[PDB]
Design a protein around this ligand. Sequence first.
Ligand SMILES: c1cc2c(cc1[C@@H]1CCC[NH2+]1)OCCO2
Lengths: 351, 13
Amino acid sequence: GHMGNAAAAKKGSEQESVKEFLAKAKEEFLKKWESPNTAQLDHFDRIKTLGTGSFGRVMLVKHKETGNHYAMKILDKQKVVKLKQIEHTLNEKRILQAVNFPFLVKLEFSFKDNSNLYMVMEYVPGGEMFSHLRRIGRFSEPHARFYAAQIVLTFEYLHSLDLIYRDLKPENLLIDQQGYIQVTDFGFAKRVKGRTWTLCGTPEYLAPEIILSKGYNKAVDWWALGVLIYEMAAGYPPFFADQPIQIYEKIVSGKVRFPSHFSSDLKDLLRNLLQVDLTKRFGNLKNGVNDIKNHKWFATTDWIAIYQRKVEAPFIPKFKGPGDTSNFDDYEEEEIRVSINEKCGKEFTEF
Amino acid sequence: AGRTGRRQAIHDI
Ligand SMILES: c1cc2c(cc1[C@@H]1CCC[NH2+]1)OCCO2
């Protein structure tokens, strides 16, 4: 076979150990998930906007008493107007308070006032993968593989808890002080025991079944991993057009072309992730995540060493000191206006 | 040709 006796036994024992780990991780998650206002706004000084989206913004803040820096996500309660927008914001807070994994950002406080919802998270000063990737062009295959391995382990963790992530992209991946990834932005994450139906995500990363208004499962995250690996290794994603409708037509076609510099092992992995047929997509078969972890492209990957953070990272961001923002782009700064009157009090009671 | 800047998620589209 491909493995000799010793290798095959080591790999099986490894796989049993993964099961043991995930069983303990589920027990820990459920305790927190069943038992989910730990600060207030005037406890922080607002420093700089780190990113901006449709419903709000993430700001660097400094805690007045301790001087610790944090990233604060502010959502305008009124702007969270659409139905799926509301439920999504409750998913995000509940999931982030309950998970624990080395590549998932840590939530420290959450609170709300008359106008906004707030989630205060660890500040990760190395910046988004997005801007490093756009600046350099593309990552070499070993560099892309180091980041990909962390996403595979993170999805194996999330999916074992029946959580789907639903927004993988370089914009949502921060690089920490050791060069490892922190996944942020759980705004679309959801606990799903089987299928779900919301049309959501980012166009370039959507699996065909989402676009086609089919009920879908955690396999959409494995499709997205294929898009992410392609984009890291090529510098642009596989389904690339100026307008969302044209992107969707490319995704559903089931045609992908690869740069001539992609190795054959990488193309084979990507063909199996970017697979429109769900009965054939890696991560969705009898062997589950092991079809990915055991693929030839990952043959050099020490999965446990990645988890344990023992592997030397390809890139360490320059760090100028606590609260440095040099690795982030600039954004327009807007007032944090808090109304005299409570808005949407009933719709956010559980937050 | 395709989108090179940051990409916004879609909530119900
Ligand atoms: C910056 C800093 C962050 C963060 C998210 C960002 C931005 C917002 C949109 C995607 N990237 O999440 C919490 C840790 O620090």
